[PDB]
Write a protein that binds this ligand. Sequence first.
Ligand SMILES: Cn1ccc2c(-c3nc4c(-n5cc(N[C@@H]6CCOC[C@@H]6N)cn5)ccnc4[nH]3)cccc21
Length: 269
Amino acid sequence: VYLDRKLLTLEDKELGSGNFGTVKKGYYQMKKVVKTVAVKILKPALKDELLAEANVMQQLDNPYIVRMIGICEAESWMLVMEMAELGPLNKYLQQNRHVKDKNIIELVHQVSMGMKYLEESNFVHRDLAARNVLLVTQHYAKISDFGLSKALRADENYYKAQTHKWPVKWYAPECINYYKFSSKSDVWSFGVLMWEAFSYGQKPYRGMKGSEVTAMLEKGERMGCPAGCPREMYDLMNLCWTYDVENRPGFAAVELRLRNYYYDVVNHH
Ligand SMILES: Cn1ccc2c(-c3nc4c(-n5cc(N[C@@H]6CCOC[C@@H]6N)cn5)ccnc4[nH]3)cccc21
């Protein structure tokens, strides 16, 4: 869990940043090999958030979730993860506009497999967006960014937030109206992630305020079908955006629909 600072080498340049601080590339020296790593470096509330994020990630073991190597307390608090070299999914698709439809289905199906595992494990992600999916290769995606994640109580199917910055354009109506977060609210966010991927990393609800997004959803309106997106995939996005939590599908149903459609496209090609 606790790593040795003497075995960690950090690069000067930063990969990216957030409200927590920066993300940098590094190397962790093992006995016979060296591990390339991605490190979150903090800029009392942020320290507690990083320790809680590390506590969630250490409990997870799935091919489609980023692996945490450990934590280190040096000049600042650090969260060390296994490196996914190609970076965030939204940026990759903005820079590689020729990625084929079959390849987009493959990647979003991998995200649904990671989420099916998280649902089975009774954890809620609470920040599922394309910026938080990292690419190992052009054909292998992993979920990261567990800073808002929660382990559900044994007697409850949801997490209740006490006081509302939130990524509002990815949040379900019950999150906004009742501050209730469940695996089904993560399904709503997964629908927005699908729209971002098929739109090659474009931002959802372009040019709209948070209050204007609420009014749109209340009228029963939803974002349109991205250019070149198959009807079957747009139908699935719309099912993820079921207003009533009770009638919205869970990740077992979403993953099965994606798996069957992916195989249909593979065997047709
Ligand atoms: C531009 N850029 C931004 C990141 C990145 C990387 C890269 N980040 C990695 C990473 N994590 C990055 C975050 N949080 C950041 C916050 C800023 O927005 C993007 C992410 N959501 C959490 N885990 C885990 C494992 N491997 C990673 N590899 C590689 C190459 C380029 C990169």
